[PDB]
């Protein structure tokens, strides 16, 4: 029932099993370049970037190449997710803007809210 912790959650920018909709909430008091990386709860391995720019949140799928490399743009592929994020932290390479400010992690919700 409770999702195990992913090793990638050591990164300030990787928030784990978070939906598109929860990501928008989590980024609602961010600035240009605020972002997080998330995985799908139901079918993990499918990761996304959510990025804030001029008051809107943009969502991008992270693709897996046939040799296992990860990319947003097929022109810039990497061995690891961390390498990809570090790349896009100075080179937009398709993204509306660069990945500049990892969103602060919040306590998981309870029935009483968040």
């Amino acid at each position: 029932y409770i999702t195990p912790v992913n090793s990638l959650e050591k990164h300030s920018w990787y928030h784990g099993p978070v939906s598109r909709n929860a990501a928008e909430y989590l980024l609602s008091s961010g600035i240009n370049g605020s972002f997080l990386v998330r995985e799908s709860e139901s079918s993990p391995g499918q990761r996304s970037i959510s990025l804030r720019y001029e008051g809107r949140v943009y969502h991008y799928r992270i693709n897996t190449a046939s040799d296992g490399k990860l990319y947003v743009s097929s022109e810039s592929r990497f061995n690891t997710l961390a390498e990809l994020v570090h790349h896009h932290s100075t080179v937009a390479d398709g993204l509306i803007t660069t990945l500049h400010y990892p969103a602060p992690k919040r306590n998981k919700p309870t029935v009483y809210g968040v």
């Binding site: 999702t3 928030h15 099993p17 978070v18 929860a22 609602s28 998330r38 309870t110 029935v111 809210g113």
Partner: protein, 94 residues
């Protein structure tokens, strides 16, 4: 046309400093709703509060007259960030 949960978000009553809002409950259980509200565009951070999932109304307080606000309502869930429904939003000027 994207769906959302909740669905029928509207201002039921307005004052210079407050907006009473309401929405239609979905068929499914929602644990709580998050309401965010902020001046449209820039420049301030949004304020936020939550209400129980049993609620379909809320009062937003401490606003300023003649200002354009963007109000967003999310359906939220305990012990999870897997919130599966698109939030709903409106714009309103006091």
């Amino acid at each position: 046309s994207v769906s959302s949960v909740p669905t029928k978000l509207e201002v039921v009553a307005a004052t210079p400093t407050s907006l009473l809002i309401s929405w239609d409950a979905p068929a499914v259980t929602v644990d709580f709703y998050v309401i965010t509200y902020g001046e449209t565009g820039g420049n301030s951070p949004v304020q936020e509060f939550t209400v129980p999932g049993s609620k379909s109304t809320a009062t937003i307080s401490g606003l300023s007259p003649g200002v354009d606000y963007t109000i967003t309502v999310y359906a939220g869930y305990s012990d999870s960030w897997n919130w599966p429904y698109s939030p709903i939003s409106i714009n309103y000027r006091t």
